[PDB]
Amino acid sequence: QNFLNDQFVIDSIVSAINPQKGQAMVEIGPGLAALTEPVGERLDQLTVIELDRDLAARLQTHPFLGPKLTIYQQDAMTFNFGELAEKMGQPLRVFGNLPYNISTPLMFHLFSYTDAIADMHFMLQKEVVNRLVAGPNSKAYGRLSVMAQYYCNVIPVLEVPPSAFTPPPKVDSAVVRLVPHATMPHPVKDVRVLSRITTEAFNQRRKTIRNSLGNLFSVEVLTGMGIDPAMRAENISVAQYCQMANYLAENA
Amino acid sequence: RKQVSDGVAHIHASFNNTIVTITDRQGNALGWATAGGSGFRGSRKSTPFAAQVAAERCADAVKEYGIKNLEVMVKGPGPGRESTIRALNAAGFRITNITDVTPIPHNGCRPPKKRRV
Amino acid sequence: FCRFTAEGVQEIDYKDIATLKNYITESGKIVPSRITGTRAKYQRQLARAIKRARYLSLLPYTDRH
Amino acid sequence: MRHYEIVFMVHPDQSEQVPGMIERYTAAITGAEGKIHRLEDWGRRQLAYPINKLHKAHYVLMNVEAPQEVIDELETTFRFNDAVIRSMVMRTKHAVTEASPMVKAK
Amino acid sequence: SLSTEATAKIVSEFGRDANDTGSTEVQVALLTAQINHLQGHFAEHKKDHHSRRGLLRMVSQRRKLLDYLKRKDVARYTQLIERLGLRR
Amino acid sequence: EPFDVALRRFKRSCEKAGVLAEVRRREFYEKPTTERKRAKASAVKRHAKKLA
RNA sequence: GCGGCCCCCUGGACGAAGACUGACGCUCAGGUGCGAAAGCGUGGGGAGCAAACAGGAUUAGAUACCCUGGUAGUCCACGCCGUAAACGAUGUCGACUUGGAGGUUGUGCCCUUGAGGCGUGGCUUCCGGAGCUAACGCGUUAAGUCGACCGCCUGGGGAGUACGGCCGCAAGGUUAAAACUCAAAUGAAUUGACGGGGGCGCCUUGA
């Protein structure tokens, strides 16, 4: 597990977040006081979840912070952010740092709240961030990056050396921000069709899509959509993936 | 109520459990017991004692069906072979054929992968 | 060794079940050559012979069958 | 031409037609201008394990020097003739005339 | 890989007498006959690469012998390749 | 024929058959490189005793 | 790389004893072809196993380690890819140069036979002399002594990475930089730590 150590990049992250009132801000994983303090400072009042009840006591008893935040002590994947968006008057800014096994769940739970979230701002490991922003025709591309880029516009904020962290890992990591689309540029009939199309395709990414999505559609459907079935799964943009999803859903 | 006597006894022993079953000469089951039904779970389920107790439970079941003769065969890699068959010597029968009948393949199909432990 | 070498020097054999029985376990498996005392040349011939003898049910494969 | 051993076994309940089989196959050999150096039967003989759920089946040997062609004929005649339950053909080094140990035991 | 009798026909054709074996003519002839025969093998046995490694050795051996004879005597070379139809 | 002497006779037969050692070792597949390495490792682990 | 058995076709090798050709040889840039495992292509097959995946557990967390499942794949025919610590990390060919204990496979002579015992090729394993080697070690199957030709290296990173060309269905392969940066980077071997020990203050590794 990790949390940051050096004021230069702490200050860079909290300043790049631009946390002020007129925003429905909520931290998750406040962790070490050093990086939760500047955001709880700049916001006149701030909401937070900590997963740990002991750290939640450490910070809630801290007079810089307990008087200056409202604090919650539970697994955030239980947490009803759609009601917190109502209680905070406008859709949320959700942000912070974590041990990040939970990362994959965080994204899906955030996406379960794409209406209730205004934006997300989080640190993550280099490979998963570069995947999350990957262009369709790259080895870094794939199913989770597809779903992420489907739900939101995604934007690297800044990148951080491993010696910057309190227990310094071996692994460089970056803060990234993302934005649930105000209207989906890719309208879809359902997301489960996307999720299964993408998993089938990426479970078979070395073979032709005739030997991946063509295990379900015909070649004449695919070419009828304007898609060459002789491509590989990692040639395919989210645009034609959502077109396939709509085709599956509407022809079923 | 049926009384017959010609008996084949099968011991099916494994590192989780030992089943024991009694059959006629035809191979038709007369009755059976395990260890797990003897009541032991987890670690106790695969012990020489639990395999004796399983044999006692079968010995009671055959008292109702047949008891004069038995031919006992043994299978699976598990513990308690001696323990369960000497528990057939309880209410002892007149038996003479013993070998295992443990399945050995002549280079049969791919076993599971080893545990990463 | 030299007495077992004479067993090889004298003969090369298949269908002599009486001699094949000198080189099998009761469970029907082939005996390893070091235990037979015979030289590897004859061990190969014996193995080939035993395989044929099993094919024609002259010898069992196992104890049971 | 190639010397061969041909060795085969017949169902106990068809063992009576075995002379007719020796006729059919020996006529194929001499009708190929091949020659024969042993013909033997070892009677009904018990099996180390069941063949086709049977026991006691009848065993036969030939030592032969026919051209390759007709060996495949009589071979495939074994897959046609269900009275033959198994056969093995061996491209042996020489013609051999001394009786089988299965006979010499008598 | 040839019958003694096909070998006998070839050496009694291309050879000086029955005492000759391995005059260049004898060699290239029996080697050629073998190469001709093996076309029937590989025409079925496409995947028999380990066998065709021997064929490659044989055709190159044929080439080497022919070229030696060509520089040693063009007449023997030309009448021999004529008889075998070589440089086909 | 005492039951426990027939049991000893049986125990000798299954020991001579090696069947528990076989079914023990047969429990998993193996990448053939590792039994190759283990085989030659045992071969030298043996040969070191030959020297006196 | 090749392992049940039989058949059918088929490659190479070694010994025997002559006979025969008559330097026909070796090496080999380009070139050509063969080339594990994985993956791809087209159409089958799919028992067992099993990336991915799915679900149950474990753990501070666990993405692992555990379990119950499970697709691709694994199999086959026909295409492709063309890489592996594809390593004896040891180019190919030829000559020479102490020994010793085996293994395997021909062969000759002697066998008193049957064992034996004199020889005598081939292949192959382990010791080790000389010599060689930074040292480790290699050592007549050289890493000794040498002859012919081919391949390859020129500090460490940047980097087998860029770019271009080629090649590939795609993966990728292949050929292949430089800027820039550092005073090293590296091989072997010696002595303490090791240490967790392990045995009995002492020898010394379940670590």
Ligand SMILES: [Mg+2]
């Ligand atoms: Mg395929």
Ligand SMILES: [Mg+2]
């Ligand atoms: Mg494969």
Ligand SMILES: [Mg+2]
């Ligand atoms: Mg490159």
